[PDB]
Amino acid sequence: KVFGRCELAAAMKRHGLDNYRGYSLGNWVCAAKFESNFNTQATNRNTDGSTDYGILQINSRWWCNDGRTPGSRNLCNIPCSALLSSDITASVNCAKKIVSDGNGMNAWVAWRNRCKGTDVQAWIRGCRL
């Protein structure tokens, strides 16, 4: 499913992302825009053989099992394919664990490079929450 901007923002809040670990909802939406273009099915293979999965492009090296990432962990205890569903619960729950792991949202490279320090509120302006 390709979410609408305000549609994803709605669903992110519902699942508890607004000010999660101090990250306002605008940050989560901007990160999703740039990680996946709001598409729950987005996949992107990394040079290191791991793959990024879903709206927030969660990586198979640490967070999920795809059965092809050598010497990898499944810290979120899911199959990576769960991260591609039109229901974002799994992506959100695994992101809560990532963003708590201690580098906060810097664990999303597109977030550090494109959202961090910007007017993130724009991404939620016009939506109902």
Does residue number 72 form part of the binding site for Pt ion (CB under 5 A)? Answer: yes
Q: Does 72 bind Na ion (CB under 5 A)?
A: yes
Q: Are 75 and 107 in contact (CB under 8 A)?
A: no
Rounded to the nearest 5°, which phi and psi values hold at 81? -65, -30
Does 15 bind Pt ion (CB under 5 A)? Our answer is yes
Rank residues 40 and 60 by Cβ distance to Na ion and give the closer one. 60
Is residue 59 near Pt ion by the rule CB under 5 A?
no
Query: CA nearest 55: which of 24, 34, 78, 77?
Result: 34
Which residue number, 62 or 107, has a Cβ lying nearer to Pt ion?
A: 62
Task: Name which position in 22, 71, 102, 126 contacts Pt ion (CB under 5 A).
Answer: 126
Residues annotated as part of the active site: 35, 52
Q: By CB under 5 A, is residue 51 in contact with Na ion?
A: no
Residue 43 DSSP SS3:
strand
Q: Please identify, using beta-carbon distances, which residue of 25 and 76 lies nearer to Na ion.
A: 76
Q: Establish whether 101 is an annotated binding residue.
A: yes
Per rule CB under 5 A, is residue 57 in the interface with Na ion?
Answer: no
Q: Is 52 exposed, middle or buried (0-12, 13-18, 19+ CB in 10 A)?
A: buried
What residues form DSSP beta bridges with 20? 23
Long-range Cβ contacts of 112-118 (<8 Å, 24+ apart): 114/30, 114/34, 115/27, 115/30, 115/31, 115/34, 118/30
With CB cut-offs between 5 and 8 Å by kind, which of Na ion, Pt ion, none does residue 22 bind? Answer: none
- The window from 14-22, 52-60, 85-93, 114-122 that contacts Na ion (CB under 5 A) reads 52-60
